[PDB]
Every structure is written in structure tokens, then in C-alpha cells.
Amino acid sequence: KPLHEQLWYHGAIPRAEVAELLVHSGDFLVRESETVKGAYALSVLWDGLPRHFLIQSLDNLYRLEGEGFPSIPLLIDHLLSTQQPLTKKSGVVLHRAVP
Amino acid sequence: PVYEPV
Ligand code: NA
Known about the structure:
The complex is a heterodimer. Chain A is of the alpha+beta class. Chain A is built from 2 helices and 6 strands. Chain A has one domain (1-99). Chain A is globular. Chain B has no helices and no strands. Classes of the chains: A alpha+beta, B little secondary structure. Chain B: Probably involved in connections of major cytoskeletal structures to the plasma membrane. In epithelial cells, required for the formation of microvilli and membrane ruffles on the apical pole. Along with PLEKHG6, required for normal macropinocytosis.
């Protein structure tokens, strides 16, 4: 389905509204980056601190560190279903798609 | 800093 129909996708929203929507550790959403042209960010509350990961792509695969997926929803689904860290160094984990 | 490494 379209990115804009995904449960966790909030489009172009201001930081004030992201900070209000992410309430507990593991809460996350996907949004447009304000400062990186055309880019998406995965924003996750982790240990009291909002964390923002630019969703990268290479060879038509979306990814944060390891090998990626053909779409952003497939990447999110993988992270949410496996509870594997977004990157090795960060240790951040997705738990709740904020609707 | 705002975004994680790329
Ligand atoms: Na990234």
C-alpha cells in the first residue's frame, strides 16, 4: 500500500508533534525529513531521548546498516517483527507503531 | 547532532 496509508507514517509533521506522539521507549513513526531533500526519517523514543534515523537506499534497497528491503514498509515490518536493533552501535529497537 | 550516522 502507499506509504501515506501505513499505520506508522505521519508525513511532514513538526518536531513539536513528533515529540508529543512518541511517549514511551520503543514508540516510533516515519516522517519526512525537513532538512534532507526528499528523505524519510525513522524517529524512535529510546531511553528518554528521541532518536532519528535517515532511511537510506542503495541499489533500490532501503536500509539503515545491513542489507535492505525493496520498500520502506518491508524494512519497518522486519524491524518490528524481529526486534533487532536498528544498528549495532545504537541498540535502538522498535516496539510500537504510533497511529 | 540530530540524525544517526549515515
Ligand atoms: Na541512517
